[PDB]
């Protein structure tokens, strides 16, 4: 493949300045918000990095919301895990709750949208 271009290491961000850069690139990416204590958090944690695997075009970014009060505040994420879907500054879906099948089913679906527009 040639989107193997990059590695699927996932990114974690570490503050509002490296969340804005990263929603604003012209790439479809899927940020998870997550934290040590919470349980269904931890049944994602594998899906998510064979997701990063599977979707070699997709960037993958963890925000840990312990560490990242602000951002949970401004975008006003209510339950842990979500995952919020964007592409260049413009958010795109998001998925509450540990539920993988759910958040690869809406990545393909939201990539095939994008590109046959």
Not at 7 to 13: G, K, L, R, T
Not at 64 to 79: C, F, P, R, T, Y
Not at 85 to 112: C, F, S, T
Request: charged share 25%.
């Amino acid at each position: 493949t040639l989107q193997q271009d990059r590695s699927p290491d996932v990114i974690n961000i570490h503050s509002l300045d490296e969340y804005h850069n990263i929603v604003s690139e012209n790439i479809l990416t899927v940020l998870w918000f997550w934290a040590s204590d919470c349980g269904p958090c931890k049944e994602i944690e594998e899906p998510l990095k064979k997701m990063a695997e599977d979707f070699p075009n997709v960037v993958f970014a963890k925000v840990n919301a312990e560490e990242n009060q602000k951002i949970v505040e401004k975008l006003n994420v209510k339950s842990l895990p979500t995952a919020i879907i964007a592409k260049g500054g413009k958010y795109l879906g998001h998925v509450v709750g540990a539920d993988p099948d759910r958040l690869r089913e809406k990545v393909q679906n939201i990539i095939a949208n994008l590109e046959h527009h």
